[PDB]
Design a protein around this ligand. Structure first.
Ligand SMILES: CSC[C@H]1O[C@@H](n2cnc3c2N=CNC[C@H]3O)[C@H](O)[C@@H]1O
Ligand SMILES: [Zn+2]
Length: 364
């Protein structure tokens, strides 16, 4: 059982005297609450390469060329290109067995990384398109795979699901919204991913989801190539989201920074994703430092461990190494993520008690 760091204990840890390996041991011991991780793009290199071989998908490529062709581990051009490679990766959604395996593995690896609260998200209609799978059996496979691992683990990690709509056709977004609500019992939130579009047009679809009791967190303010910040205004003012996926472009506008703070919105920051997709110049210039210092609530997230060949503790390493975040900062961020989690209040209460009970400093 991971020896999770406690709030009152952090002042005794000297990270400056540690090797990279020893720091990773400390990142593992942070009780992490992760809000933004696409389960359908969450795997290791090994898992991915097996899948490709299992279905004889690339007989002309070495393992290394398969990783290069399909994934984004060295970074790319833009979110646009990222969306194009995701489409390619859908080569592996061959059947429901591989899907269930994917879900077991993803949860197991989060557990070993020291995540205690995990909101996974996935896009059913996406996962279905390549082989025209049935979204109902896709969901059953994922829920089954998750339940089995959580049970095996004695509920040591708490997992919830969010449903993502993708694309810019009302028909597909509506079909996802209906699926999400049909499966309200499993889904705790509703998202939009894919190319970044202004969601204001789909107001009535999102209203209906939000008003049926499923809160919203949509991808917005990620893609630096958009000619304005309209997508952020829409998510906040029209969709009335509780959280924003990425939202890093909020840093470009004092008006938006004030809006997010005043509305108590949390930004689900994905540091490595933004650098690899060219939405931040380098980790040294990542807006999370500005936003955190401006008093915006932000949490740390991996986004797509499979596309980047990373895990959540790599994001912590980069933030510590490039931007000088501290263990205190990390604990504060995870407690914000805990408070803004869409999971049941009973579960959040348990987690608070288990991991976030003390205070950083003694009463004086
Ligand atoms: C199997 S991924 C299904 C999808 O969800 C989308 N997505 C996955 N990871 C992210 C996605 N969308 C936008 N921003 C990049 C990243 O956060 C992806 O482009 C595809 O549209
Ligand atoms: Zn994402």
């Amino acid at each position: 059982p991971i020896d999770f760091l406690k709030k009152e204990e952090l002042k005794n840890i000297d990270l400056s005297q540690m090797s990279k390996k020893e720091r990773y041991k400390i990142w593992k011991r942070i009780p992490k609450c992760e809000l933004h991780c696409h389960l359908d793009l969450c795997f290791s290199a090994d898992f991915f390469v097996s899948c490709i071989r299992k279905y004889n998908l690339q007989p002309n490529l070495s393992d290394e060329e398969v990783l290069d062709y399909y994934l984004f581990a060295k970074g790319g051009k833009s979110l646009g290109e990222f969306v194009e490679k995701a489409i390619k990766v859908a080569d592996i959604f061959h059947d429901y067995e591989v899907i269930e395996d994917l879900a077991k593995h993803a949860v197991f690896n989060k557990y070993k990384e020291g995540v205690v609260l995990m909101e996974f998200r996935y896009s059913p209609t996406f996962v279905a398109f390549k082989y025209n799978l049935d979204i109902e059996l896709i969901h059953q496979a994922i829920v089954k795979g998750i339940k089995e691992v959580v049970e095996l683990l004695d509920h040591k990690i708490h997992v919830a699901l969010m449903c993502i709509g993708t694309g810019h056709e009302a028909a597909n977004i509506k079909a996802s919204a209906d699926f999400c609500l049909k499966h309200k019992a499993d889904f705790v939130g509703f998202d939009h991913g894919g190319h970044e579009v202004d969601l204001k047009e789909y107001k009535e679809i999102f209203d209906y989801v939000r008003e049926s009791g499923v809160p919203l967190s949509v991808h917005a303010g990620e893609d630096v190539t958009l000619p304005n910040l309209n997508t952020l205004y829409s998510a906040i003012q029209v969709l009335k989201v509780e959280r924003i996926g990425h939202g890093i472009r909020v840093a470009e506008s004092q008006e938006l920074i004030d809006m997010v703070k005043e509305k108590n919105i949390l930004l689900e920051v994905c540091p490595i994703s933004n650098v690899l997709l060219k939405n931040a110049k380098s980790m040294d210039t990542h807006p999370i430092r500005q936003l955190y210092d401006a008093g915006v609530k932000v949490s740390v997230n991996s986004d797509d461990p499979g596309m980047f060949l990373t895990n959540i503790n790599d994001d912590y390493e980069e933030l510590y190494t490039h931007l000088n975040f501290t263990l205190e900062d990390f604990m504060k961020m995870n407690e914000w993520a805990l408070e803004k989690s869409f999971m049941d209040s009973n579960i959040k209460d348990k987690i608070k008690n288990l991991y976030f009970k003390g205070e950083f400093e003694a009463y004086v």
